[PDB]
Amino acid sequence: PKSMQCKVILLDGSEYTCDVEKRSRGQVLFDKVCEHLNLLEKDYFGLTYRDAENQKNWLDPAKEIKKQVRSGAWHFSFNVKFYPPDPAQLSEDITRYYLCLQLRDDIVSGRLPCSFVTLALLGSYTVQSELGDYDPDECGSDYISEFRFAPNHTKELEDKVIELHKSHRGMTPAEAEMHFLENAKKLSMYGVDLHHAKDSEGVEIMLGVCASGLLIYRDRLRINRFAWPKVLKISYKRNNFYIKIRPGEFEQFESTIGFKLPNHRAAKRLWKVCVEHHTFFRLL
Ligand SMILES: CN(C)C(=O)c1ccc(F)cc1Br
Numbered sequence: 001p002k003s004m005q006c007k008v009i010l011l012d013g014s015e016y017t018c019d020v021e022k023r024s025r026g027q028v029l030f031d032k033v034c035e036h037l038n039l040l041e042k043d044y045f046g047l048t049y050r051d052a053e054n055q056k057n058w059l060d061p062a063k064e065i066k067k068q069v070r071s072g073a074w075h076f077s078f079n080v081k082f083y084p085p086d087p088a089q090l091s092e093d094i095t096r097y098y099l100c101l102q103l104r105d106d107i108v109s110g111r112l113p114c115s116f117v118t119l120a121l122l123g124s125y126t127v128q129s130e131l132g133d134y135d136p137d138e139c140g141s142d143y144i145s146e147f148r149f150a151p152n153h154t155k156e157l158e159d160k161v162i163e164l165h166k167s168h169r170g171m172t173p174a175e176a177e178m179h180f181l182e183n184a185k186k187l188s189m190y191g192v193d194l195h196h197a198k199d200s201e202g203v204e205i206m207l208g209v210c211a212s213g214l215l216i217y218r219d220r221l222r223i224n225r226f227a228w229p230k231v232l233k234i235s236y237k238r239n240n241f242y243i244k245i246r247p248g249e250f251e252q253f254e255s256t257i258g259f260k261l262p263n264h265r266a267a268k269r270l271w272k273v274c275v276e277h278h279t280f281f282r283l284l
Pocket residue numbers: 228229230231232233234235274275278
């Protein structure tokens with residue numbers, strides 16, 4: 001039995017190394033990573049890899065690892081795949097903990113835009129979780145946390161984190177993580193997977209995929225939203241991605257919205273992530 005070395009970037013930024021038989025399906029590696037993390041609520045998570053176009057792809061647990069990474073290195077990241085609309089309903093604190101780490105990366109990276117005050121508040125819960133109660137000793141007027149809180153740090157933001165941290169005295173890690181999630185889950189881009197596309201007129205848009213449905217970001221003014229109930233069918237052909245929309249009551253015929261993706265692979269990727277979110281957030 002020939003085994004391949006796999007390297008997985010964990011959500012705390014550490015590296016986990018293991019071996020799988022070279023013909024292993026993605027589920028085999030995923031089960032090994034989840035055991036290492038003591039994670040039971042595995043359905044929300046998945047492994048990503050970077051393709052030869054350098055694009056993030058979900059490792060399909062049902063398919064051979066080798067048929068997906070193809071020519072690439074057996075290097076992966078551990079990520080949230082389905083962001084729970086209501087993290088309070090997850091059964092385990094460790095589940096909420098990994099969701100927090102993913103979200104901290106979403107914020108720092110700028111995938112999850114956040115106001116000043118919400119950056120500082122989220123920051124303040126992370127600090128309470130990780131260091132416990134505010135202590136002036138390791139905090140002077142010039143203090144700067146090791147914690148990355150935002151795409152761009154300012155002294156004002158560091159001060160606001162400390163001010164809000166003072167207010168959380170006695171808060172346990174599980175409690176701070178729950179408060180973090182009750183705030184994060186309300187952000188307009190929470191759990192939104194964005195894909196670059198052009199509309200049928202050739203205008204640059206973003207397609208968002210999330211729990212509740214599809215979002216078409218034309219710009220800040222005029223954002224189309226298709227709840228899953230409204231979506232009849234979605235398809236891809238070549239570089240094209242088409243959304244079939246239900247008729248309104250006493251309308252005879254569905255509407256079709258077509259989009260142009262950068263290439264055939266980007267169309268197929270968007271299609272797969274829509275089907276997966278549609279299945280998940282038709283069962284939840
Ligand atoms: C193949 N497939 C699952 C579809 O075309 C689809 C249909 C309805 C919907 F709400 C979302 C999707 Br995705």
